[PDB]
Amino acid sequence: LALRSAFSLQASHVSSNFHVFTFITKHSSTCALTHIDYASIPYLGLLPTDLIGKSLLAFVYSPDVHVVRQAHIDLHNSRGKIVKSIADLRLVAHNGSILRCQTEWSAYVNPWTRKMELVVARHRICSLPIGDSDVISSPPPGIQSNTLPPVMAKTFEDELRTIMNKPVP
Amino acid sequence: LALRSAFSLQASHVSSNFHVFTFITKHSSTCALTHIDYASIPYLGLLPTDLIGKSLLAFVYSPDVHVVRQAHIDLHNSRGKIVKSIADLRLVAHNGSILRCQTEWSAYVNPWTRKMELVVARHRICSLPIGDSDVISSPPPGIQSNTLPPVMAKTFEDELRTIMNKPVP
């Protein structure tokens, strides 16, 4: 079974509207991702194996991590009800191409510990990503890293754990 | 590292109150378990490997499955807020011993699909289980199965999926 980019799938799906598409990510209060729709594979090229052990920050466009941070703070204050992002969220596909999304956030609050224990995000793409359309491919040698370097990922992840470990008021 | 029953751990934890204990299970809307506190191992003897692919019904005391069923129906109508069980919930440890609990239920409702997508249960034990105290052990040959037979597990699991697949009113 071949895996193919959303652009490529158009040739054999001539009536579909591949620019019209939403997908969900989920992660726990360790920041560890526990879910991404498989339907997102033609859009980001990211496999469950790519993501085992990592947070959203493994593929968020680096200067957009503040969108994520503020979403967790806004969720703590809404007690998990739907919050809007402060700006578009851009995600980096496996091949380095950039997928701009509009993202809404939801959170599950454990009623006994009163802490957030699941964060759910619904991403609505604005288009197919800019760059080469074959997100399934490997990125080209000599591309700048467009995600956070490990030390900064750990720095922002540390703060998100602290936010989620605080009892919801 | 040895794994030991809660009764056994008393000898080297002379000030602890092992009869005072609560633990959480979690499962998704396929009924598939995704979580059980590791601290429950001295109480039930059940490992993550015992549970990969199974629902709560793999270790609920068989005539108590109605407690679970009604909890899912009561959660659908509460929209995920804390519901009480209609009766005690008894769980079957790995060695066949029976652990009676008082259980409260919580559920996460996806705000976009409006369906339950996580069910969380907080189990408060009433005592150490009746039967041999070494829940870590294998059950004795020639014991009656005190959980649902596979055909009935699949029958009750089918209904729980149907309950959870219905949009919360």
Swiss-Prot record, chains A, B:
Gene assigned in the entry: lin-42
Disruption phenotype: Mutants exhibit a delay in development characterized by a strong molting defect, resulting in a prolonged L1 stage followed by an arrest in development in the L2 stage in most animals. There is increased expression of the heterochronic miRNAs, lin-4 and miR-48, in late L1. In addition, there is increased expression of the heterochronic miRNA let-7 at the L3 and L4 larval stages. Seam cell shape and connectivity is severely abnormal during the molt stages. Animals display a precocious alae phenotype, with the early formation of either full or partial alae in the adult cuticle.
Superkingdom of this protein's organism: Eukaryota
Entry's localization field: Nucleus; Cytoplasm
Function recorded in the entry: Transcriptional repressor which interacts with the promoter region of target genes. Has a specific role in developmental timing where it regulates temporal expression of a number of miRNAs and mRNAs. Controls temporal cell fate transition during embryonic and early larval development by restricting the expression of specific miRNAs, including let-7, miR-48, lin-4, miR-35 and miR-58. Restricts the accumulation of lin-29 in the hypodermis to the larval L4 stage, thus controlling terminal differentiation of seam cells.
Lineage summary: Eukaryota, Metazoa, Ecdysozoa, Nematoda, Chromadorea
Region forming the signal peptide: none
Complete-protein stretch covered: 147 to 315 of 597
Domain (PAS): residue spans on this chain: 9-77
Protein's organism: Caenorhabditis elegans
Protein name, entry field: Period protein homolog lin-42
